[PDB]
Amino acid sequence: ERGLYFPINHRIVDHRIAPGVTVEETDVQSRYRRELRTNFATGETRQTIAPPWSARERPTHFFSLRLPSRNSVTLRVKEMHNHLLFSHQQCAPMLVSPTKLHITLGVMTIPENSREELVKNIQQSMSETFACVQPLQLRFRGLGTFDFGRVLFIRVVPEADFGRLERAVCDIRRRVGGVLGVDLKGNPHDSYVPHVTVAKIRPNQRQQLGDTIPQSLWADYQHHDFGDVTLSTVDLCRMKGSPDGYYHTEGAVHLS
Amino acid sequence: ANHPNRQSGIQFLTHYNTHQRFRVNKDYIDYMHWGKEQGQARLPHRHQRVAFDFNDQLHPTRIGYAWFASQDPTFGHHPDLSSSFDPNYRVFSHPEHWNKMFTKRRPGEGDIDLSVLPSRSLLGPLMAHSDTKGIPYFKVDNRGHSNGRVPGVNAPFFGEFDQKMMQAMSRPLNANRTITGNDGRFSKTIMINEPQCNQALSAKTASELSKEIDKATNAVYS
Amino acid sequence: EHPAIWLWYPWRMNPEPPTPHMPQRRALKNVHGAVFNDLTPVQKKRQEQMLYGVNIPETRQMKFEEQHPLLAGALRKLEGQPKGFPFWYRKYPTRRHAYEYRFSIPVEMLDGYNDDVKKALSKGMMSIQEKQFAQEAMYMERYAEHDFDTTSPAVLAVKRALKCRVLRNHLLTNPHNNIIKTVLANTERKLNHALRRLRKVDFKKYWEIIRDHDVQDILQPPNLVTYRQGSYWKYDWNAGLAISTNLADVMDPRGLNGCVETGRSRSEVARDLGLSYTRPLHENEKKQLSHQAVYYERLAKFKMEQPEAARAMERERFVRKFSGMFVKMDIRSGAPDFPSTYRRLLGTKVVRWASKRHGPN
Amino acid sequence: HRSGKARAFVFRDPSLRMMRAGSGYQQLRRMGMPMQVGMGWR
Amino acid sequence: RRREENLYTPIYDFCHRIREATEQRKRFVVVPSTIETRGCARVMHDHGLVAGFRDFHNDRAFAVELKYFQGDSTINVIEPCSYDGRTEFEWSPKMMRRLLNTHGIHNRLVVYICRTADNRIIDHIHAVKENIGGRGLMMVH
Amino acid sequence: YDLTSLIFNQPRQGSDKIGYVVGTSMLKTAVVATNHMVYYPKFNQRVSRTKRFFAHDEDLACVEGDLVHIKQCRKISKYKHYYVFSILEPNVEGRERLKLGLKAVPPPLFGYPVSRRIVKLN
Amino acid sequence: IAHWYCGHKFRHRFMRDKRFHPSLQASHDARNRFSKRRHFKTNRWNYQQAYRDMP
Amino acid sequence: RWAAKFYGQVTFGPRNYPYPSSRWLARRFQMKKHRIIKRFRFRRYKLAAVANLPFAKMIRVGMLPELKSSKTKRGDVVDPTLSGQLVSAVKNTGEKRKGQRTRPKSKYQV
Amino acid sequence: SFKYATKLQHDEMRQPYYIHEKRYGIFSNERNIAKARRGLPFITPLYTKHMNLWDTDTDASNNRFFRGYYYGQRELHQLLGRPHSLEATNADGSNDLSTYEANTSQ
RNA sequence: UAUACAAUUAUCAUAUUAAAUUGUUAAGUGUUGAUUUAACCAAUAAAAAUAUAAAUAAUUUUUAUUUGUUUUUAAACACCAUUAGGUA
RNA sequence: UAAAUUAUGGUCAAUUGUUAGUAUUCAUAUUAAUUUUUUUAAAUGUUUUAUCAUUUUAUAAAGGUUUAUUUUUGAAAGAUUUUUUGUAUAAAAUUUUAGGAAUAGUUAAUAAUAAUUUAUAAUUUUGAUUAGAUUGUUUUGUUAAUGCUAUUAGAUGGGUGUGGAAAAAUAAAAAAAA
Ligand SMILES: [Mg+2]
Ligand SMILES: [Mg+2]
Ligand SMILES: [Mg+2]
Ligand SMILES: [Mg+2]
Ligand SMILES: [Mg+2]
Ligand SMILES: [Mg+2]
Ligand SMILES: [Mg+2]
Ligand SMILES: [Mg+2]
Ligand SMILES: [Mg+2]
Ligand SMILES: [Mg+2]
Ligand SMILES: [Mg+2]
Secondary structure: OOOOOOHHHHOOOOOOOOOOOOHHHHHOOOOOHHOOOOOOOOOOOOOOOOOOHHOOOOOOEEEEOEEEEEEEEHHHHHHHHHHHHHHHHHOOOOOOHHHOOEEEEEEHHHHOOOOOHHHHHHHHHHHHOOOOOEEEEEEEEEEEOOOOOOOOEEEEEOOOHHHHHHHHHHHHHHHHHHHOEEEEEOOOOOOOOOEEEEEOOOOOOOHHHHHOOOOOHOOOOOEEEEEOOOOOOOOEEEEOOOOOOOOOEEEEEEEE | OOOOOOOOOOEEEEEEEOOOOOOOOOOOOOOOOOOOOOOOOOOOOOOOOOOOOOOOOOOEEEEHHHHHHHOOOOOOOOOOOOOOOOOOOOOOHHHEEEEEOOOOOOOOOOOOOOOOOOOOOHHHHHHOOOOOOOHHHHOOOOOOOOOOOOOOOOOOOOOOOOOOOOOOEEEOOOOOEEEEEOOOOOOOEEEEEHHHHHHHHHHHHHHHHHHHHHHHHHOOOO | OOEEEEEEEEOOOOEEHHHHOOOOOOOOOOOOEOOOEOOOHHHHHHHHHHHHOOOHHHHHHHHHHHHHHHHHHHHHHHOOOOOOOHHHHHHHHHHHHOOOOHOOOOHHHHOOOOHHHHOOOOOHHHOHHHHHHHHHHHHHHOHHHHHHHOHHHHHHHHHHHHHHHHHHHHHOOOOOOOOHHHHHHHHHHHHHHHHHHHHHHHHHHHHHHHHOOOOOOOOOEEEEEHHHHHOOOEEEEOOOOOOOOHHHOOOOHHHOOOOOOOOOHHHHHHOOOOEEEEEOOOOHHHHHHHHHOOOHHHHHHHHOOOHHHHHHHHHHHHEEEEOOOOOOOOOOOOOOHHHOOOOOOOOOOOOOOOOOOOOOO | OOOOOOOOOOOHHHHHHOOOOOOOHHHHHHHHOOOOEEEOOO | OOOOOOOOOOOHHHHHHHHHHHHHOOOOOEEEOOOOHHHHHHHHHHHOOOOOOOOOOOEEEEEEEEOEOEEEEEHHHOEEEEOOOOOOOEOOOHHHHHHOOOOOOOOOOOOEEEEEOOOEEHHHHHHHOOOEEEEEEEEEE | OOHHHHHHHOOOOOOEEEEEEEOEEOOEEEEEEEEEEEHHHHHHHHEEEEEEEEEEEOOOOOOOOEEEEEEEEEEEOOEEEEEEEEEEEOOOHHHHHHHHOOOOOOOOEEEEOOOOOOOEOO | OOOOEEEEOHHHEEEEEEEEEEEEEHOOOOOOOOOOOOOOOOOOOOOOOOOOOOO | OOOOOOOOOOOOOOOOOOOOOHHHHHHHHHHHHHHHHHHHHHHHOOOOEEEEOOOOOOEEEEHOOOOOOOOOOOEEEEOOHHHHHHHHHHHHHHHOOOOEEOOOOOOHOO | OHHHOOOOOOOOOOOOOOOHHHHHHOHHHHHHHHOOOOOOEEEEEEEOEEEEOOOOOOOOOOOOOEEEOOHHHHHHHHOOOOHHHHOOOOOEEOOOOOOOHHHOOO
16 A cells, blocks of 8 residues: 555566466465675675686685785774674674785685796786886775675775776786786686775684674675775785784785 | 838848847947948948949958069059058947937037047157167067968069959869869850969870860850 | 735835845845855955965976076076076066066066166055956966966866956945946856866866865756756766766776676676776665665574564465455556556546656656 | 738748758658557548 | 847858849859858859859858849849758758759759758759759759 | 667667766666657757656666666666666766765755745845 | 637737747746746845855 | 836837837827726725735735725735734835835825 | 648558568567557557668668757767867768767777 | 748847946125016025046856935925925 | 760649738638438347356446556467477657646665665656646648648456456347357
8 A cells, every 4th residue: 555556576487487387386485585686785796716626726825915004994994893893793703803904916826846936937927017007096995795705805996096907917817827827716818806805704714603794794884985095015925824924925016 | 120220221241240230239330420431321331341343442452562573663552452451440430439328418428438549649659669679670470471472462473463353263174273264154264273383284284275275165155 | 023025006116115124235146046245264365365465486486497497597697687688588478477566577677677666566566457367367377288278178267266256355345236246147157167167177176276266156056957857967068078088097997888788787797897886875875775785684583583473474464465456466456657557547436646646757 | 010910021932832841741641750559540 | 149039050141141242233242151152152153143153261251253144133032941050951852853843844944952961062953863862952043 | 860869779769868867866776867859840840858767776886967878678666667778977076076975966056946935034 | 720729819829839839948048938927036035055065 | 117017009000110109009008007097096006915925916905804995895805914914014104214215105005 | 742642541652561560570460469458549559660761770871860960960969079060061960070080990 | 610920121018248336526794685487475595527448259147137216404406385394 | 163965764733712091811712511401221039058057258338538558378279199488567759728836645775574664755847736628649621832720439446356368237230169
């Protein structure tokens, strides 16, 4: 009586059920708008997906833009942690320490034998790619999820110097994965989605934490604005958490 | 049109932004003091006319004789070369420039702008008189005549004067615009136009002329 | 006491003046009908800063020294000595460029003369009109793309902004000259044009002009009617700046376009490339979305922890589906706009709706 | 007659009257412009 | 100057310049210079309705030389096809073919000028020849 | 025959429209003002009329004063049959205006006309 | 002109046709064609401070 | 101005008649205008237009029960508060207060 | 041009039927004829327009209705940023190419 | 009852590219009385002078702004009433 | 910025009032109509069937609607031993009154939610909603002609919801299972 007789959002045909079934044999009931609920609402993001053989092996090193000291980002993420922990303190193991915040430009697997040839060669190619690029001012607002809501990150908006990043990345992508064959978890002809990972659930953690980060935590910060940052520093990092208190850094390039 | 302020009529042959002369807000005319030389006071002044009569002279080309050296030594000043000619020249009109409407029209009254008539006061030439010679001596100006090299004005003038416009509008009889023509009812004018090479005809241009000449000559009405 | 009353004795040409009497001095409107009682503190600051004097920025001396280091070298040898050759001519390309002394007399030309003369050509001796022209020339110079630029949008916008302020404070003093009311309104209109062309040429300069001279009041869309029809945004179509953006420096174009063969929108290809374009949200949209995101968690918790309440509500819904107006979906029932497609029922048979149109169509 | 219809000074060239009629409703019906949404003639 | 007024076209006042300059028996007219205007002039000069014409590559205007015979002009009437720019008349080949026919006798007496899709300014006679339709400009005779 | 059919090949009339975004007060909904054409055969001339549409932008990109491409689609809500297909011209000034916390566009000074005289002073 | 439409005079017909004329149609410049005068001087005494959120 | 300049069409002469009106016609219409105006004066007409009300519809105050001239005809129905205020307006319009601007007075205004 | 050509009841004055096939496919109407509510008043709209006038397919070069200046083409040129005028060099409304069209091979 | 305005010039009420706005000057007492008016009546009589240049042309002011009604007579003329006053 | 010819081609545009100084489509004309005349309609009982039942037989009652009316094959056609499919309900244009103001079970998001979910909502002066008149987008008359001037009729809510589809309560002129 307060709206349409048949609300338009409720008109749904399921074509993944056989024809004739719903007319005679039985009726099928489901809450159908959990599935139809879109990629903007859920906060999912489609990352470059790995081929199965690459999907098998752990990633070892990654490219990163290092966040400078005195960031808008780091500050606001600290504020966000405060708020989240005051709401639910079950988040505490999920959250990444503000010390480890960095922009992830791509991920890669390096085998341990060819290690030095690869790090030297990579470092060199990287330095050539970024030779001409001056520092990058990028904008961060919004949250998103990788790997079925297990990884919770801060989006990099394509409103700014981001454009340049995309060419820049796509060049190293075509060198590191194209030229010297290296395992980039995706195709070298495809571009990686840059992100700042905030909360994460590792395999070991998953038992006590659960299989997905409940959206009730970060729902309100989903579109929150973390601000602008200029970035001069590119790293190639191996992931060791006890060597310096920051991800162990195998290579570096200065944008100037 | 019997309405006052509509008397100036419909003239299209003016240069203004309306074909209706009486909506034009630029030049308000003066019916009492105007039209000695132009006939009616409605019509455009001698120097602003965009349409020309058969036996009347058209506008003088402004100079701003040295360049006639090739011509008849006796030939004097060509009638159409003038030192001072202004297509934009404000003619004094009382209702515009001297406007008595807001007054009782007593002898001194009415508002006057002096920007129209050139000042006949001695104040100007006294106040500006300098030991440095004038603009012409100093040659401050760039450019020159706006059309560049002009046979009458800047450069010298060779050949013949066309005082009627007869050669100036003719139709090229050729794809190359080498040969041009002017046809009256019973007469035909074929004019060779190659001023650059001194009227020296090429093989193509000559073989063309022998066509235009006999097609003009074997015409019915010539 | 309560509404004004016009009294009209119909044999008379016009009514008698109203009883509350109105304000004795008529309000001064801007072009759009908005009221200004006085200059805003910013504009006031602009005129107070024009009045006592202007100055040439040492910016010009600097670029003069870097561009033509020889001439500046000469003037640097000759300071205080009378000069017979004007080496400084490159510093002042135009007549208008020299405002620091009257009659466009450059500073270093006064070197060899009397100090009395120096005081007689000073700023303090300018007329008010001259002072306006001074402020205008200074600002025109700071926003100009080259020396002789006039007609370009930034310049135009600035000079019209200044003219507008002048006329405004003028009208503040002597109330009725409606000639200048009209000239102020026309100037304001041409300013509106100039600014709206600016924001599509270069927007930061547009911003800083609005912030310097405090004209945001003439950028406000006049009335809701013509705005709702999108004729406010239709202006920069007519100006030819609508496509002028040159995206690639801003807004990576990959997620602004839809797929022709696929049919998927721009939000879809943005989804697929893992990009997010989203306008910054106010608190409305944020708290709506953050309220909606959580529906299923709230629901799961409800039907786990409290099954009886749920089953009650469900009883009501399920049984409702059998009661009510229409039990099945047909063209009649499934008409998205019921009152619209059947208007012929609205007075007599169908009493639910009192009007045939609740939306655009 | 200030209150009444405007009259032409002379006639109108009939040929021009026929030239300005090219896009008129009849020619359009012949071109097929209007959609046929109803039964029309029987 | 206002809304109700017609929207003038270089063709409109080209025709009226020529008409008025013909009524005052002038030898030369200075007239607006656009593509279809000097097109119209070349066509009129073809048919001999005009003594001559020239474009000086002056931007605004060019000049036409009028022809008189037996004391009155060679032009009875000259009229533009449209009063506005907001109205555009299209001439079917059959229409332009009707003009040519006076109750069974072939009549080229009156000339009609028109644009083509090919940007040519043509009389109706060549148009009918190649069976192309065109947009109307003016009639003259 | 107008601009819209000039640029597009439409499967069905009105399947494509180009317009400006006027207002976003509704989540995932952009209102769009669009022009179309009417012909008067008596006077042989065209007029442009204008019409508003509700378009569905998932993900909320459209800022008031965007030039957008719009398409016909599935019935979405009571009044939305159109979705935003592409942003032709975004509003850069408006977006930066939002980023600073201000409204995209200043709110119109006067509303709809009235037949009364409102005396409201100070 | 059929005499039953609009007023009893003829010119009433052409006065309502001017309402449909193509070049006379309502737009962003020409507005309120049918009642201009009911809306005249309506906001004179309505004092509205203009909208500035930028300095 | 509110009231009508003319009554009926006062400029009817042939086209290009080089005056707005002829003497004859203008005299006829001057007669009709005269009669109407005289009617307004003697019947003591009063109109009002109030703020925040539809303006085209003017309350006729000369027909109000207090200010009504006739002893017979039923006058009009206007709100009690509003009508009190109208009566006060009409009353305090009458006489010149010093410092106020002098406004034309008549017998028929009362 | 006469009254007899006003009567479209002749088949010689009327765009033929088959056009509606050529647009929507052959034998497409046999579907529509069996529809529930038909011909009271309305039938599924029958599109017959001479194929050289089709708005869908054709453009400014082969169709005279597109090259009408003052409403379609004026807007288009304002948008694309070409210089334009009433009587222009190009068939449609435009004196010259825009900057983009001059600097880019398409 | 149906059955073809003008568009080159048309006088009553739907304006629109415009340079204005602001100026502290003058005038007044000797003496015994028919001035003004076609004619009446009241009853000191003298007076208020200065500004050009400059403002750029067009494209979204039509709910905005605008077309000889105006504080102060303890200052007159003038006008209206008639010696009482009104207005200026 | 040059003419053109291998010559009438690509199939018909053609206006008829005897007025009364002059200005302005206005009495008396022709064509088309109503005035005007029983040579085209028609009467009731639909029909099978397995028996108190069940199969076949789907748009002429009225009301007055101008952002308005939109849809499938599961019936029949229909072919064949049994299962078989997908496409549909949505829109865009065109919309009347001489003197013109506000409208409302109400928008959008959520969802098989909410007689109190969330929100800075929706329609309107580019003319709304009520209210008058009116049966909407191949049909006529006049005319040399852009015009002017006609076109009927037929879809009027729900309440054990049958049926493929509500079109389901006299009023055919549709052969309805030998
Ligand atoms: Mg609807
Ligand atoms: Mg009703
Ligand atoms: Mg009087
Ligand atoms: Mg007809
Ligand atoms: Mg008027
Ligand atoms: Mg006074
Ligand atoms: Mg029925
Ligand atoms: Mg109704
Ligand atoms: Mg519709
Ligand atoms: Mg619909
Ligand atoms: Mg019932």
